[PDB]
């Protein structure tokens, strides 16, 4: 007789679909697993035209991967959001999400309500945010050179697991003087980046 939906529509249940989604998300964590600590390395992506793309940041690696899975696209979205917000820990969020999924996989396979798991995740996130805001340890009044020293230390820490790790003490003062002379609204488009061969 006449069919209901269109001929060629894939369907799934619940528990097997969630298991497959967890197994697919566990593979994305292995792509940004080595690029993390200072002793980590980088990857090399080749497109269909023959151009090499070498980048240690996980955002570029996830963008150049071109994933077609509907469940694996959640990591790329949060990675792009983190890169647009502050632009720092792009792989730590993915690693934490993969660890949470691997931890809740047995709890899901045993037979637990997803609403309870979502509520527990929300409560744990709120508690962690409150604890971090409590032990934030901020200052109110510092010296003129103390702010520059803190900026240099933050720059050296952020440029520790990068390619220019051997010259992290030279670019710190440069970026400090560049940001300090950026008016008050902090216009990132006003900084010119030139690349000269040699």
């Amino acid at each position: 007789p006449v069919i209901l939906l269109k001929e060629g529509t894939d369907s799934s249940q619940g528990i097997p679909q969630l298991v497959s989604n967890i197994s697919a998300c566990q593979v994305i964590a292995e792509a940004v697993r080595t690029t993390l600590g200072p002793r980590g390395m980088d990857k090399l992506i080749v497109d269909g035209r023959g151009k090499a793309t070498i980048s240690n940041d996980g955002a570029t690696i996830l963008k150049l991967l071109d994933v077609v899975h509907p469940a694996a696209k959640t990591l790329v979205d949060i990675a792009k959001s983190q890169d647009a917000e502050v632009g720092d820990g792009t792989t730590s969020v993915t690693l934490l999400a993969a660890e949470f999924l691997k931890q809740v996989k047995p709890y899901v396979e045993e037979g637990l309500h997803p609403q309870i798991i979502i509520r527990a995740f929300r409560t744990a996130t709120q508690l962690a945010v409150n604890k971090i805001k409590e032990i934030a340890v901020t200052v109110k009044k510092a010296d003129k050179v103390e702010q520059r020293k803190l900026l240099e230390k933050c720059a050296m820490t952020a440029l520790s697991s990068k390619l220019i790790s051997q010259q992290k003490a030279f670019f710190a003062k440069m970026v400090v003087d560049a940001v300090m002379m950026l008016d008050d609204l902090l216009q990132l488009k006003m900084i010119g980046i030139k690349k000269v061969q040699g």
Partner: protein, 529 residues
Amino acid sequence: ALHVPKAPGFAQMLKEGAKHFSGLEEAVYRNIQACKELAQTTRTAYGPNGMNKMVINHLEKLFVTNDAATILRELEVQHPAAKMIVMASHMQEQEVGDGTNFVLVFAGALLELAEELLRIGLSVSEVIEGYEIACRKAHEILPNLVCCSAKNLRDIDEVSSLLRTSIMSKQYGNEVFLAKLIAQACVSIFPDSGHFNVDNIRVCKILGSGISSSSVLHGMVFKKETEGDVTSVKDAKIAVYSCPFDGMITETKGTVLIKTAEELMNFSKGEENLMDAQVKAIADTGANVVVTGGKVADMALHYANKYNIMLVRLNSKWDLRRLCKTVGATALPRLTPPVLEEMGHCDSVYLSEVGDTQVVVFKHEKEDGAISTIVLRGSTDNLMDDIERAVDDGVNTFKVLTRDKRLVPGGGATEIELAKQITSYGETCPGLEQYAIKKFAEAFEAIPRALAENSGVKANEVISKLYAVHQEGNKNVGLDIEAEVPAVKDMLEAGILDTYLGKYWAIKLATNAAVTVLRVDQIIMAKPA
């Protein structure tokens, strides 16, 4: 072997590619089975405890929503029996906006309970008459179960307490903040003498932090930039011009004719002088920012930047009218200085950025005003779309409550009471319509059963306890949610209230779709193109 021929009459002239289903088995039963299979798909996503669904269309997109309307729209069904239910759901969403899955479940239950009647012997006419009588009885008894009305509509401590039930069913967990935001947005745009518009709420999706970082804005926002160098403007006098900020020419194709050298030397000089004079005359009225809606020029931009005039360029043929209605100004089709009654008084016009995205914020310090804009913050497009859909559903519920301030006890007590009243009324009805009345009364038990199945408890025990409570004397007692043990809970003390006119229209449309499907006899199709 031996091959049988065709029927010498109508089967031979039926033409290949088409189909024919004249019998009741290959038509009515097939449509009933198709409707049952369609209802068995979107059944687990009904109550607040139901899960979401990720549907992908043929455009290689992503739609992870929870409402049944979006699921039915992004499905592409090739069956008329389900197409009728899809059209009914679309009509219900266009009318009210909060009663699609309920209509689908009611229609599926009615068809499932009428299939057995048609099998045992009840014809289509008697079943249709009994269903119509039961629907009329339910529509007559429905206004007798109100006992709840809305007091004020502009109180922020009362509007957020009514839409919380509708918001929790779509977004379980984070509902108080969304309800407060919707109430504030509705209060900031509430005019006078009623007349609430649905296009006065603008939603903006900005990829930022979490959900708690979102806030409301008393004004409008645009994801553009500033053409000039003027940014921070205190007392801004907006002068919107519908014409493009350039030199006006003739509509008919015409060139300039020059002969002597004096004209060739003075043409550009006179043009620049006239442009400077027009720029000085425009800025002489006190305008601080000019919002155009077309192509700009270099000389005009330079003359505006020389006199410190902010230029905002945008083309959408709707945002300009929205800004004009918000600031209270009129559009001018020519480059003429406006009058005092055609000025756009604002409060603060600046250019900032949030979430690595430059946006122009038109915040006003007035508590009232015209329209507002809700800014959304998140990390995924699906979550932002779900939040926008929840905000739209809350706005529709607020509009329905403003149109009709009558409330009914939500949860599942109203359906149980209606079924009990229909069963009690149908007991004294002689003839053969008593079976149809009792079957229509049994269709109301599909909502508590689905709620118990989505929660994770026994549906039979919950239904029995609800029936016992209704027979004892209590009428506003539904099914508890925050309890793993199948028990009961009061709906009036908790605050589970839903609209009455919306449910009435949903029941009416469900009955109409049911009788329309039952009225279909044979099916005659053709070949796909």
